[PDB]
């Protein structure tokens, strides 16, 4: 009733084949490899987890832990001052600030270890398997659509979380991390459930049907008999006779076809010209041409030779430049070049992550709030740098300084 | 029932051949050699072992050892101050600082020697043989798969560890070293067991089967009859007739074939052209072309000479550049180049380790914990620099400074 | 180099090195392993990689010399 088949057509198969370089290849196309990188997704995962865990810190809990450690070490400031029998403010101030600094950086290391354990638990299920990011990105590149199949289930990620959190010894030693983990735990459980639920359709096993009268989609798995959903970022066009996509491969398609045809014709012409001497036969290493087959009351009046051979270097170079420029502009990639003109590194710009990573989470993953998205510089840096940067600004440092200021000032003012 | 062979087909054998330069070779392909480097894995082992050793330190045990050394040297602050008979606190402060600093660097030398022995114990078995890193890399490059055969058994690595730890007299001298080694012992045994258990399949024997109807793999050893696991990083695609892999060699395949065919055609055309003078005969150093063989009731009309010779400089240069660019972008390698654009060294970037080294440990080797991944700068630096860097920021330095300041206060008030 | 004898087996994958004259049995160590492709063996040494190009270059030089010698005549 107005429906038409879309995906199993050979056109999309040819698109995917040209993505793998089945015909033609240029170094400009090589920039596509960084477009499939999962660095941004992992950065977003760890930043969101860091924000979630650290915002659960309690001022009272950390004050209780600090006073418990103080009692355990017996470092009562009045007792230390009386034992030292001096009014040297600088000495006791240095001692107190150093002790608080050692407590703060041991807390930092413990929190870093626990967060690293959590993010390592979450890491494997992101890139490979369910919600595979490269599959989403090459779906958007090939056609501009992201088919999805949803099903509520318990997955291996939840099993890993369960096998991780309970037996972790850090809950027994540090109380504050225990309360922080337990109060936010259902959020991580829901995140794991969302990870399991979302499955991205495999390219060669999914069928897409579109109806043009009303403009609605239908996606189903021929083998599993499961109905899914269709998500579109930039919609296609329906001319009435053929559905015309608007993906970058669609735009690039005619030029690659022309270049490949030219290269094939050049090869065919080159193969013919292997001969050295040619002759002709007519009525009154070597190749003989015989016109006697078609001689019928005829006679040769003249003959000509023109050994053409096509050239294709500039066309390949232009195709490489076009590939590079299109892939740079479409995905808003960021390029770094030095004074002499040498390329140094390729990284995602802030626009790229804001335009692709965030909608991925909000629609393909259906994940809850992810907090403030990272900046373009953060993805370049390392995990420890991101951890320190987020730790400095956020809530925990304010409580830490709040404790430190009064704890220090009390002993010297006394 | 839907199964089909994957590896024994001549395509993968041709891929492995083309890596070894069986056909064609260019300067760009040479950058593959630095990819197979084992420096990153060894640096990761060093960092992991250093972290696993240092965290086992005990503040009480370190204090006990320091006070025992002080008592052995008779460095009682009260007695030494009474002997000096002067009010110069600077002298006693400097003496205490120097003595504790020599204790510091003696502890550091002992720790680094023991750690170097331990890492040397794990050094040979890791990157080569069982769980050999270059085989993992060239499996990823050839196909995108990493066949694995697993078996739980004791290995020579554990034998070396056993020959090391209890035969090391360092435990009898320093209490802290013995206590830390005893605490961290089981983890190293688990690491050795993980090293021995994992075996990477060899290219010439193992067989892998695929089935698209349900998307499953089957890997087995034809001779030993052992069944294993099939790991995939970037999956392939099934287009009915064939299975187009998504490895870099697969992308590069058509261009190399075209270049090699052109070189062969150029050679065969060049060999023919060695003649200087050529003549032809017909019915009424030297080469004679007898057209009389087919000259029957036929008569010549004209003759031609077009001595073509193909050239291949441009294709070779482009292939070299394409090889270099593809290998640089695919594995996220990093280059260092100076003012005039000439390179000086090749390094293993942070993205490279984060995308290859870590999943290798987590899946191929099934390591329990690797700690915080190193930065891209650490692989450049030497072992001693890495040890010194990891020593400074960690718990043992905190304990060391805590002891130092309290001892300085005690000696200055004494 | 010119004395030692090296034997290899493909089904089990083991080596055997012995001195033909002294009769002494030794030990075989490998850094990067070779490859077994049926009725052939392919090493992975740098010279092995460089081999297919040097042969072509030497053949080209030989053919150039052969052609040069012929053209010494004037008429």
Numbering used by the authors:
A (entry chain d), B (entry chain c): 24 to 27, 29 to 308, 494 to 623
C (entry chain a): 227 to 301
Quote from the publication:
Three capsid types have been recognized from the nuclei of herpesvirus-infected cells: empty A-capsids, scaffolding-containing B-capsids, and DNA-filled C-capsids. A unique portal vertex exists at a 12th I5 vertex through which the genome is translocated during assembly. Here, portal proteins assemble into a dodecameric basket-like structure that is thought to seed the assembly of scaffolding proteins, in turn driving the formation of spherical procapsids composed of MCP, SCP, and triplexes. A separate protein complex, the terminase, associates with the dodecameric portal and initiates genome packaging and the concurrent autoproteolytic cleavage of the scaffold.
To improve the resolution of the portal baskets, we carried out separate sub-particle reconstructions and refined them while imposing C12 symmetry, leading to portal basket structures at resolutions of 3.6, 3.5, and 3.7 Å for the A-, B-, and C-capsids, respectively. C-capsid portal baskets are positioned higher at the portal vertex compared to their A- and B-capsid counterparts, which has been attributed to the densely packed genome pushing the portal up against the capsid shell. However, our D-capsid portal structures have the same portal basket position as C-capsids despite being mostly devoid of genome. These observations together suggest that genome pressure alone does not determine portal basket height, and the elevated portal position observed in C- and D-capsids may instead be an irreversible step during capsid maturation. C-capsid portals did not vary in height but were still capable of 9 degree rotations and ~1 nm of portal basket sway. D-capsid portals had 4 Å variability in height, but otherwise resembled C-capsid portals. These findings reveal distinct patterns of portal basket variability, with A- and B-capsids exhibiting greater positional and rotational flexibility compared to the more constrained movement observed in C- and D-capsids. The C12 reconstruction of both A- and B-capsid portal baskets revealed a small hook-like density with large aromatic side chains and sharp turns wedged into a hydrophobic pocket between the crown domains of each portal monomer. This density is weaker in A-capsids, but still conspicuous, whereas it is completely absent in C-capsids, D-capsids, and mature virions.
